[PDB]
Amino acid sequence: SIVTKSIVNADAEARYLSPGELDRIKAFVTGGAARLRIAETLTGSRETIVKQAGDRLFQKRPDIVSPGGNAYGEEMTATCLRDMDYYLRLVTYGVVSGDVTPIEEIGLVGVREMYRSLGTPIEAVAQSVREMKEVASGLMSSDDAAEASAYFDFVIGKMS
Amino acid sequence: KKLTAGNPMNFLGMARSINPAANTIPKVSAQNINIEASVPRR
């Protein structure tokens, strides 16, 4: 969250929150309804965001859904879409919080260990999130898409 | 038991509906590759 992030930054310096930090918090709470609308949008169209993005992924990376691919077979394919659903939900957590720590603490710390243990090609996961970013962006205005894109790009930049 | 969130069963219908196309069986042969001449040179 933006509030927690600034508090931990201020506590790390054993100081009260600075005026700059307090102004950022004030703006975030006062622009709160606009962010929740974006999260409401992502949440409501989560079925189509994941399905279309997942459909695009397998077209972009047919090997992962071929014999010997990590997502070969309908059941493995389902787990891949589940994982995409996980990451979309995390993006909506980041949107309403104004901070990436909820995304990081839930689904990016140790992600490389998890996916290498499973054998999943992580960069294809970065691609799947990338695909969700286009589908989501095309369901909202450019300014709203920009706000959500920052969090999509953070997930993409970390796994990739 | 009732399915809960995160369970991949929830996405089997989406997987079946997407019905992704697997690649065709490759026909590549190791024995017919000249490694030295085929590796790219830049």
Binding site: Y72, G73, E75, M76, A78, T79 | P8, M9
Partner: peptide, 4 residues
């Protein structure tokens, strides 16, 4: 690979 099956999860069932």
């Amino acid at each position: 690979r099956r999860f069932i």
